[PDB]
RNA sequence: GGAUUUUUGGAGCAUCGACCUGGUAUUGCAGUACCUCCAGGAACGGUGC
């Protein structure tokens, strides 16, 4: 089974997407597509050796994301 | 869904892979993460390379810019459609 | 300005309105925990505003002791009152009534049906001070503290149940060394936990509780709070025993005990104060910790579906019938009609009869197609 | 309505510093060719002027802030919470008394509509 | 069970929801499926019987006031106050002639009603909550 | 369909990702190297053909130069890692 | 009519002729400039033509602004905290003002990144040694009233008022 | 939805823009990459190695 279907069924979850170029955006992920496009609202982004700015909305691509961090209160058996 | 088309024709700032930020009115998009930014302005930060020098950002306006998905990293909304 | 007469009465009326709003909030029943927490936060904000108003009104008494000799004098009086009435004799051309002298503090300290929040507390939100895992004071988030403890211990042999059992101790032996760096994390896990004391009960006095905790730490914890029957007296800073009380009193002012060690009363006093505050927070909020441990056990013992269920909680009809066609009727005050048949039906009606009765024309069949007032007057005069 | 409210507040401030009931700063002003219709009790504004005079008299109390400082109302949230609970209990007791009075009125109306009005006796 | 299809007086079918006609039975069943049919579907005694009556002797004392009658009643041991009401002389047990006056009668539950005739038209008010009083400590009833 | 699912199961049980199938059989920890020189050791709950892994109770260690670099590490409860940044996946770690 | 966020949100913000983001606010007659922080630092030029602003003050912290157009106004006084609000200011158009004294341009030397200045059609330029005092006050300005600074003018500014 | 163009990863030197001084010819109607040349100073910055 593909791992994109498990990530597509996630809404209103405070996740942290760490990008490839030293960027990490922590926020409530509101939308996920089949191409791993993560659209989040009211997030905080921290770049490589920079101050963490706050954005009202963000849309990270699939190839630009390096890793993800989920909360502890998220079962993985029902999502797969 | 259609979350990418909800923020169309607004003053959005897309972060590039090299560290620059292109702010413009994203009028057209596609499935390959392409963007058509009308009246776009690209801002790139410069290194101070000293102990007392500050960090500056050179900004240049280009107009209509067709940015491919290979360099686009993340796009954030900055301003409403005028 | 009447700072002793008008301002003091206004502050007393504002305090009475705040007390009435607090009594109306306390008299109303509660149905949810988040709404009760929001009502408690609004009551705490109203009590803080009333305390600020009382502190502002209690400081306006310096000139009152000098003005009471002239205000209570019976020789004076209506001369200054007549001068103030002549000063209040300005232009009354501003025809506007202002009933919001006392109704506006009554409406500002009230809530609406769509949103149960006051007007100063309209921007308050329960999601900006508590997380979703806490449940607005129902449980405590201990995943980040367990991750920090697993990172500090550098071992994967500590689960959530082991961390909950290690955190449940109050006066037992610690799992790590007191002079290590993990105690520097033990303040940080207390740094939100004391914030839980500001989260689980916003209506309680935090300053008086902090003063009582400081008095219990200074007068009792610094003078041998744990007696014995080395085991007679134990010191939290030096981590050493004592033979008697006189030996402990002589060693309390010693040179290694003051500043001649790495865990003396000079540098390790804040760590001991944070440990005492964490112990007081664990003793005061032990039921919330037990509820969080029961919720963690119920989440670990459930399946994936149970955990997922727990985590989720017409133009053609207007064109054929002759509608949408503007017609002007000069008899009934130049009214508009959207149809010839509608105007013919409204001609033999009560509105057209009441319009024609003002001109003196009787309601007959000759004035059915009459529109202008002059033509109707000529038809009435010709008959 | 701001000028009339300001005049009523000025009259309540001038009448509160009097040494007697009839020897005030507004009784002599009535004979000084100054029209003041708010002094008569027949007007509807007299009920508000009396409440303003009562508030001005309560603002001159020794615990009102002239010669003493309140500590239980200004530096004790638990005392304010106990006062709010006592006010809520008094409001609940007043609501229970109003419900008992309404039940007694309903019982009297039920008893009056069932008695015999034909057994007349003239003594 | 369609509540809109009915039978007319000519042996046909009529849809009152869309107001349509159908000659045969095969056209009425085919008229339910369509655009206009879907658009029309989307667009559309105990206290009186238990009262004890022994009829005791009342004690009323009248007095002409100027600016009131006092009725001495025994202890009733209840919260029900005695009520006064003004009635006419047209209704009676035997209906005597020349009855064209009014009578104010005060009645209680353990006692009988005491009535006083008023020859004047209006000299007072017989309202219960306005000008009546009943002291339960001394059991004194007054009405003015 | 069912035949494609059986072929994917055979390719996951007997192919190069069979060591990843060892991660979901006995719940053993694996060590994955990232492109940013950050080694993540932990158990793998779910995998795919594109090497996208779902890690539970993972520990990520790396070298950060302030001198000599220190071994700063972190511990995450649940995480997801894409297959584009995976360099080398070791089935049996040392410690 | 006072200036607020509703006048800035309904204004036309577009690209100017100098390839910069400019918001047109001509024909407003605003007596005071306030609540200008609703742009979220998304503009580089602010036009204030045909206004009744008596004093140029009350400007929020904007780092993206690089041009100020205060032409056709009635500014008699100048604000002092202009350098702390616009650190990247380069162009200043203060033409058609009511400046009379030479001390009004003393906070105007607080901007270190200022290079363009325009004080034409003003009574302050009618006085003697006005350009020399403007060159001696702010040496970072290279173009004053559509004219480049001179080395002899800089020597006369350094020699005078010593 | 995994095989080169987008989405399951290649991760002190040279050049250009300026800043300031003098002579020099063009006075000209267009949507222009930039726009005359020489000489002198610089203790200005960006890019790649």
Swiss-Prot record, chain B:
This is Small nuclear ribonucleoprotein-associated proteins B and B'. Methylated by PRMT5. Plays a role in pre-mRNA splicing as a core component of the spliceosomal U1, U2, U4 and U5 small nuclear ribonucleoproteins (snRNPs), the building blocks of the spliceosome. Component of both the pre-catalytic spliceosome B complex and activated spliceosome C complexes. As a component of the minor spliceosome, involved in the splicing of U12-type introns in pre-mRNAs. As part of the U7 snRNP it is involved in histone pre-mRNA 3'-end processing. It is linked to Cerebrocostomandibular syndrome: A syndrome characterized by severe micrognathia, rib defects ranging from a few dorsal rib segments to complete absence of ossification, and intellectual disability. Belongs to the snRNP SmB/SmN family. It is found in: Cytoplasm, Cytosol; Nucleus. It comes from Homo sapiens (Human). Residues 1-81 form the Sm domain. Patients with the autoimmune disease systemic lupus erythematosus (SLE) have autoantibodies directed against some of the individual snRNP polypeptides. The most common autoantigen is called Sm. B/b' bear Sm epitopes. It comes from the Eukaryota.
UniProtKB/Swiss-Prot annotation, chain C:
It is found in: Nucleus speckle; Nucleus. The keyword Transmembrane helix does not apply. The modification Phosphoserine is found at residues 54, 121, 246, 250. A zinc finger (Matrin-type) spans 327-358. Its main location: nucleus. GO terms for cellular component: catalytic step 2 spliceosome; nuclear speck; nucleoplasm; nucleus; spliceosomal complex; U2 snRNP; U2-type precatalytic spliceosome; U2-type spliceosomal complex. Keywords: Acetylation, Metal-binding, mRNA processing, mRNA splicing, Nucleus, Phosphoprotein, Spliceosome, Zinc, Zinc-finger. Residues 294-313 are annotated as: Disordered. The modification N-acetylmethionine is found at residue 1. GO terms for biological process: mRNA 3'-splice site recognition; mRNA processing; mRNA splicing, via spliceosome; RNA splicing, via transesterification reactions; U2-type prespliceosome assembly. One of its GO terms (molecular function) is RNA binding. A motif (Nuclear localization signal) lies at residues 175-179. Ubiquitous. Residues 294-305 have a biased composition (Basic and acidic residues). Component of the 17S U2 SnRNP complex of the spliceosome, a large ribonucleoprotein complex that removes introns from transcribed pre-mRNAs. The 17S U2 SnRNP complex (1) directly participates in early spliceosome assembly and (2) mediates recognition of the intron branch site during pre-mRNA splicing by promoting the selection of the pre-mRNA branch-site adenosine, the nucleophile for the first step of splicing. Belongs to the SF3A3 family. This is Splicing factor 3A subunit 3. It comes from Homo sapiens. The gene is SF3A3.
Swiss-Prot record, chain D:
SURP motif repeats lie at residues 7-49. Ubiquitously expressed. The record marks 10 as: Critical for binding to SF3A3. It is found in: Nucleus; Nucleus speckle. Changing residue 3 to E: No effect on binding to SF3A3. Coiled coil: none annotated. SURP motif 2 mediates direct binding to SF3A3. Component of the 17S U2 SnRNP complex, a ribonucleoprotein complex that contains small nuclear RNA (snRNA) U2 and a number of specific proteins. Part of the SF3A subcomplex of the 17S U2 SnRNP complex which is composed of three subunits; SF3A3/SAP61, SF3A2/SAP62 and SF3A1/SAP114. SF3A associates with the splicing factor SF3B and a 12S RNA unit to form the mature 17S U2 small nuclear ribonucleoprotein complex (17S U2 snRNP). SF3A1 functions as a scaffold that interacts directly with both SF3A2 and SF3A3. Identified in the spliceosome 'E' complex, a precursor of the spliceosome 'A' complex. Component of the 17S U2 SnRNP complex of the spliceosome, a large ribonucleoprotein complex that removes introns from transcribed pre-mRNAs. The 17S U2 SnRNP complex (1) directly participates in early spliceosome assembly and (2) mediates recognition of the intron branch site during pre-mRNA splicing by promoting the selection of the pre-mRNA branch-site adenosine, the nucleophile for the first step of splicing. This is Splicing factor 3A subunit 1. It comes from Homo sapiens (Human). The lineage of its organism: Eukaryota, Metazoa, Chordata, Craniata, Vertebrata. The gene is SF3A1.
Curated annotation (Swiss-Prot), chain G:
GO terms for biological process: mRNA splicing, via spliceosome; RNA splicing; spermatogenesis; U2-type prespliceosome assembly. Keywords: Acetylation, Isopeptide bond, Leucine-rich repeat, mRNA processing, mRNA splicing, Nucleus, Phosphoprotein, Repeat, Ribonucleoprotein, RNA-binding, Spliceosome, Ubl conjugation. It is found in: Nucleus. It comes from the Eukaryota. Its main location: nucleus. Residues 122-160 form the LRRCT domain. One of its GO terms (cellular component) is U2-type precatalytic spliceosome. LRR repeats lie at residues 19-40, 42-63, 64-85, 88-109. One of its GO terms (molecular function) is RNA binding. Changing residue 72 to K: No change in spliceosome assembly. Identified in the spliceosome B complex. Identified in the spliceosome C complex. Found in a pre-mRNA splicing complex with SFRS4, SFRS5, SNRNP70, SNRPA1, SRRM1 and SRRM2. Found in a pre-mRNA exonic splicing enhancer (ESE) complex with SNRNP70, SNRPA1, SRRM1 and TRA2B. Contributes to the binding of stem loop IV of U2 snRNA with SNRPB2. Involved in pre-mRNA splicing as component of the spliceosome. Associated with sn-RNP U2, where it contributes to the binding of stem loop IV of U2 snRNA. Belongs to the U2 small nuclear ribonucleoprotein A family. This is U2 small nuclear ribonucleoprotein A'. It comes from Homo sapiens. The lineage of its organism: Eukaryota, Metazoa, Chordata, Craniata, Vertebrata. The gene is SNRPA1. The chain holds residues 2 to 163 of 255 of the full protein.
């Amino acid at each position: 089974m593909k791992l994109v279907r498990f990530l597509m069924k996630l809404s209103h979850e405070t996740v942290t997407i760490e990008l490839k170029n030293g960027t990490q955006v922590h926020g409530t992920i509101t939308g996920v597509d089949v191409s791993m496009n993560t659209h989040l609202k009211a997030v905080k982004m921290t770049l490589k050796n920079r101050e963490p700015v706050q954005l009202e909305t963000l849309s990270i691509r699939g190839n630009n994301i390096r890793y993800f961090i989920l909360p502890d209160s998220l079962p993985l058996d029902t999502l797969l | 869904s259609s979350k990418m088309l909800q923020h169309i024709d607004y003053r959005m700032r897309c972060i590039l892979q090299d560290g620059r930020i292109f702010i413009g009115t994203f009028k057209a998009f596609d499935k390959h993460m392409n963007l058509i930014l009308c009246d776009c302005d690209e801002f790139r930060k410069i290194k101070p390379k000293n102990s007392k020098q500050a960090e500056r950002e050179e900004k240049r306006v280009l107009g209509l810019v067709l940015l491919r998905g290979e360099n686009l990293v993340s796009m954030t909304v900055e301003g409403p459609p005028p | 300005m009447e700072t002793i007469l008008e301002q003091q009465r206004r502050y007393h009326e504002e305090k009475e309105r705040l007390m009435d709003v607090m009594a109306k909030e306390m008299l109303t029943k509660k149905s949810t925990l988040r709404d009760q927490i929001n009502s408690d936060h609004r009551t705490r904000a109203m009590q803080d505003r009333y305390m600020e108003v009382s502190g502002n009104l209690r400081d306006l008494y310096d000139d009152k002791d000098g003005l009471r000799k002239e205000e209570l004098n019976a020789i004076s009086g209506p001369n200054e009152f007549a001068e103030f009435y002549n000063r209040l004799k300005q232009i009354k051309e501003f025809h506007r009534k202002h009933p919001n002298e006392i109704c506006v503090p009554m409406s500002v300290e009230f809530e609406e049906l769509l949103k149960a929040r006051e007007n100063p507390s309209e921007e308050a939100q329960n999601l900006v001070e508590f997380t979703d895992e806490e449940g607005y004071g129902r449980y405590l988030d201990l995943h980040d503290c367990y991750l920090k403890y697993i990172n500090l211990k550098a071992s994967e042999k500590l689960d959530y149940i082991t961390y909950l059992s290690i955190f449940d101790q109050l006066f037992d032996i610690p799992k790590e060394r007191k002079n290590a760096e993990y105690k520097r994390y033990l303040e940080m896990l207390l740094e939100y936990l004391q914030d839980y004391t500001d989260r689980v009960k916003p209506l309680q006095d935090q300053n008086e509780l902090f003063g009582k905790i400081q008095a219990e730490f200074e007068k009792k914890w610094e003078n041998g709070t744990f007696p014995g029957w080395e085991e007679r007296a134990q010191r939290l800073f030096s981590t050493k025993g004592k033979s008697l009380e006189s030996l402990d009193t002589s060693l309390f002012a010693k040179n290694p005990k003051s500043k001649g060690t790495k865990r003396d009363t000079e540098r390790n006093k804040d760590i001991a104060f944070l440990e005492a505050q964490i112990y007081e927070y664990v003793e005061i909020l032990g039921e919330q910790r037990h509820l969080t441990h029961e919720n963690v056990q119920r989440k670990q013992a459930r399946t994936g579906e149970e955990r997922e269920e727990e985590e989720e909680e017409p133009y053609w009809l207007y064109k054929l019938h002759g509608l949408n066609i503007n017609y002007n009727c000069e008899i009934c005050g130049n009214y508009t009609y959207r149809g010839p048949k509608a105007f013919q039906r409204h001609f033999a009606e009560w509105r057209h009869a009441h319009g024609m009765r003002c001109l003196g024309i009787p309601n007959t069949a000759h004035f059915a197609n009459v529109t202008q007032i002059e033509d109707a007057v000529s038809l009435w005069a010709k008959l | 309505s701001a000028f009339d409210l300001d005049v009523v507040k000025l009259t309540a401030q001038f009448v509160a510093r009097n040494g007697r009931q009839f020897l005030t700063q507004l009784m002599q002003k009535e004979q000084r060719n100054y029209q003041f219709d708010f002094l008569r009790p027949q007007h509807s504004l007299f009920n508000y002027f009396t409440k303003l005079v009562e508030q001005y008299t309560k603002i001159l109390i020794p615990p009102k802030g002239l010669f003493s400082k309140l500590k239980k109302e200004a530096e004790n949230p638990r005392e304010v919470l106990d006062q709010v609970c006592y006010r809520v209990e008094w409001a609940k007791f007043q609501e229970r008394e109003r419900k008992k009075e309404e039940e007694e009125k309903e019982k009297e109306r039920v008893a009056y509509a069932q008695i015999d009005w034909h057994d007349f006796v003239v003594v | 069970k369609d509540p809109y299809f009915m039978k007319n007086h000519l042996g046909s079918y009529e849809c009152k929801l869309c107001l349509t006609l159908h000659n045969n039975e095969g056209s009425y069943l085919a008229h339910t499926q369509g655009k206009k049919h879907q658009t029309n579907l989307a667009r559309r005694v105990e206290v009186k019987k238990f009262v004890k009556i022994g009829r005791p002797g009342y004690k009323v004392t009248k007095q002409r006031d100027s600016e009131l009658f006092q009725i001495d009643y025994p202890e009733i041991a209840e919260g029900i106050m005695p009520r006064h009401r003004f009635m006419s002389a047209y209704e009676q047990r035997i209906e005597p002639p020349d009855r064209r006056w009014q009578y104010l009668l005060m009645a209680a539950e353990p006692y009988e009603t005491i009535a006083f005739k008023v020859p004047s038209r209006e000299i007072d008010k017989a309202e219960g909550k306005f000008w009546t009083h009943w002291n339960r400590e001394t059991k004194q009833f007054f009405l003015q | 369909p069912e035949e494609l699912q059986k072929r994917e199961e055979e390719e996951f049980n007997t192919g190069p990702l069979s060591v990843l199938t060892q991660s979901v059989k006995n719940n053993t920890q694996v060590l994955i190297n990232c492109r940013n020189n950050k080694k993540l050791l932990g158990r793998v709950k779910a995998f795919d053909r594109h090497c996208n892994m779902v890690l539970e109770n993972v520990k990520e260690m790396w070298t950060e130069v302030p001198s000599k670099p220190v071994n700063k590490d972190r511990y995450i409860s649940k995480m997801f890692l894409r297959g584009d940044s995976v360099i080398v996946v070791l089935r049996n770690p040392l410690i | 009519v006072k200036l607020t966020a509703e006048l800035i949100e309904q204004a036309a913000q577009y690209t100017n002729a100098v390839r910069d983001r400019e918001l047109d606010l001509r024909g407003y007659k605003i007596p005071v400039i306030e609540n200008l922080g609703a742009t979220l630092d998304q503009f580089d030029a602010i036009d204030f033509s045909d206004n009744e602003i008596r004093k140029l003050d009350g400007f929020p912290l904007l780092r993206r602004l690089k041009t100020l157009l205060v032409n056709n106004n009635r500014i008699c006084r100048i604000g002092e905290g202009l350098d702390q609000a616009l650190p990247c200011l380069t162009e200043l158009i203060l033409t058609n003002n009511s400046l009379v004294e030479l001390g009004d341009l003393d906070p105007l030397a607080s901007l270190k990144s200022l290079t363009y200045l325009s004080i034409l059609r003003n009574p302050v330029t009618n006085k003697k040694h006005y350009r020399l005092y403007v060159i001696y006050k702010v040496p970072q300005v290279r173009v004053l009233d559509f004219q480049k600074v001179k080395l002899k003018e800089r020597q006369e500014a350094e020699k005078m008022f010593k």
